[PDB]
Write a protein that binds this ligand. Structure first.
Ligand SMILES: Nc1ncnc2c1ncn2[C@@H]1O[C@H](CSCC[C@H](N)C(=O)O)[C@@H](O)[C@H]1O
Length: 350
DNA sequence: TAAAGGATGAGGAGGAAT
DNA sequence: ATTCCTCCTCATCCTTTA
C-alpha cells in the first residue's frame, strides 16, 4: 500500500537534508533504455500500485517542486536512472514570493502570510474576481487591516486561484510569462501561434517543472558525451526537451508524440529558435504509432537512449468532479500506451 | 465564432488532540 | 488506536460576452 514520503523530497533535493545516493532496482527494470515517467502524486487509490507494477515494480520517487521553485507541485516520478551525483541548473531559482514577485512587495498586505504558491493548474482566476476583491477592500484603505471576515474572504480566494498583488487592493492571477518562468520555460515559450490566453494556461498546467525534471536528468550528461536520442511521449510543450537543453545535453534526435497541433508547433518553434542541430520528428496520436515505425526509426538512428513522458492525469486529478475514475478513464488509460512503446524499445535495446 | 466566466465536491493528506 | 479540523487538487461543462 503506497504511502507518500513526508517530507516529499524523494531521494533528496538541493539545500535540504535527507539525501540518498544509491538504490536497488529489480534486474528487469535495468536499462537500456533509460526511461522516466511522470504523473500526479494525489491519485485515487491503487493507481500508483498499478503503475509501478507495469513499470517493472519500480517504486515511485515522490517530489514536491516546492523545493525547486516558488509554486508547489506534488508529483510522482518512476525511472531506472542512477541517483549519485545529480546537480541542478543555473541560475538558482526564486523560492519565495518575495523573491519571485519583487514588484509585488509594495502592494502585499501583511495579513497575507503566504511565502509560497499553490499548484499552477489549467484554470486561472477571472478579471471580475479581481474587482470583487477590490470593492471589498477600498472601504478599509485608511485602516491598517480589513475586518477578519473580509480577510478570510479574500485570503481564501487568493489561495484558490493563486493570486498575487499587482496594485492597490488589486489581486490578479498569474500571467503566462509568469507561469513559464515559475515552471522553468523561457518567456513566450507558448506565445507564438495566435494561442489564446485560455489555451496557454491549459498547456502550462499540464507540464513539468523543468528544474525538478532536469535535476533528475543531470546524471545523463557525463555518460552521454556525444548526445542522446529521445523518445518523448505525451510531449506537450516540451518540458523534457527544455530540461535537456538547459542541462547542455545534445539531443541528436527527438521523436515526439503529441496529439495537440499547437503544442507540436510550440516544440517546433523552440527547436528552430534554439538553433538546435539534431532532428525533430513529430507524431500526433500515440494510439496510431505502430511498432513497425518505432523499430524502423531505431534501425536508422541507432536506438533510443531515453524514453520520457507524462501520461494524462485527467481521470486521476482531484480537480476533476466528473471523471475521477482512475486508470480506467478514457484519457489516463493511455498510460498503457506508454508501456506498450517502452516494451518495443526494450525488445531491441536488450 | 472564439474566448472567458462561473458552477459543480469528493477525497485524502497532514496535523493535533486524546 | 481513535476523533476533529484545515487545507489542497496537471479539471469538466455549460453559459455568457465580445
Ligand atoms: N492520444 C494521445 N496521443 C498523444 N498525445 C496525447 C494523446 N492524448 C493526450 N495527449 C497529450 O498528452 C499531454 C498530457 S500531459 C502534458 C505533458 C506536459 N504538459 C509536458 O510538458 O510534459 C497533453 O499535452 C496532450 O496533448
Amino acid at each position: 500500500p503506497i504511502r507518500l514520503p513526508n517530507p516529499m523530497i524523494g531521494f533528496g533535493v538541493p539545500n535540504e537534508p535527507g539525501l540518498i545516493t544509491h538504490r536497488s532496482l529489480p534486474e528487469l527494470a535495468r536499462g537500456p533504455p533509460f526511461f522516466y515517467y511522470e504523473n500526479v502524486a494525489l491519485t485515487p487509490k491503487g493507481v500508483w500500485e498499478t503503475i509501478s507494477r507495469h513499470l517493472f515494480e519500480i517504486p515511485p520517487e515522490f517530489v514536491d517542486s516546492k523545493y525547486f521553485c516558488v509554486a508547489a507541485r506534488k508529483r510522482g516520478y518512476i525511472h531506472n536512472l542512477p541517483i549519485n551525483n545529480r546537480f541542478q541548473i543555473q541560475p538558482p531559482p526564486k523560492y519565495t514570493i518575495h523573491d519571485a514577485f519583487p514588484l509585488s512587495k509594495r502592494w502585499w498586505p501583511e495579513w497575507d502570510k503566504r511565502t509560497k504558491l499553490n499548484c499552477i493548474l489549467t484554470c486561472t482566476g477571472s478579471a471580475q474576481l479581481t474587482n470583487r476583491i477590490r470593492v471589498a477592500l477600498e472601504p478599509y484603505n485608511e485602516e491598517p487591516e480589513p475586518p477578519k471576515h473580509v480577510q478570510r474572504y479574500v485570503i481564501d480566494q487568493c489561495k484558490k486561484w493563486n493570486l498575487v498583488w499587482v496594485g492597490k487592493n488589486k489581486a490578479a492571477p498569474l500571467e503566462p510569462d509568469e507561469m513559464e518562468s515559475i515552471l522553468g520555460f523561457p518567456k513566450n515559450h507558448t506565445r507564438g501561434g495566435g494561442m489564446s490566453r485560455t489555451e496557454r494556461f491549459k498547456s502550462l498546467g499540464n507540464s513539468f517543472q523543468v528544474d525538478t525534471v532536469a535535476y533528475h536528468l543531470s546524471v545523463l550528461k557525463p555518460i552521454f558525451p556525444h548526445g542522446i536520442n529521445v523518445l518523448s511521449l505525451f510531449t506537450g510543450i516540451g518540458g523534457g526537451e527544455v530540461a535537456l537543453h538547459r542541462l547542455q545535453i545534445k539531443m541528436k534526435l527527438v521523436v515526439s508524440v503529441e496529439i495537440s497541433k499547437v503544442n507540436r508547433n510550440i516544440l517546433k518553434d523552440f527547436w528552430e529558435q534554439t538553433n538546435q542541430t539534431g532532428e525533430l520528428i513529430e507524431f500526433s496520436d500515440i494510439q496510431h504509432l505502430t511498432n513497425d515505425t518505432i523499430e524502423g526509426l531505431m534501425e536508422k538512428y541507432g536506438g533510443f537512449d531515453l524514453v520520457i513522458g507524462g501520461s494524462p492525469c485527467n481521470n486521476l486529478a482531484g480537480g476533476n468532479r466528473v471523471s475521477r475514475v482512475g486508470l480506467e478513464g478514457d484519457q489516463s488509460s493511455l498510460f498503457f500506451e506508454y508501456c506498450r512503446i517502452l516494451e518495443v524499445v526494450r525488445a531491441r535495446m536488450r
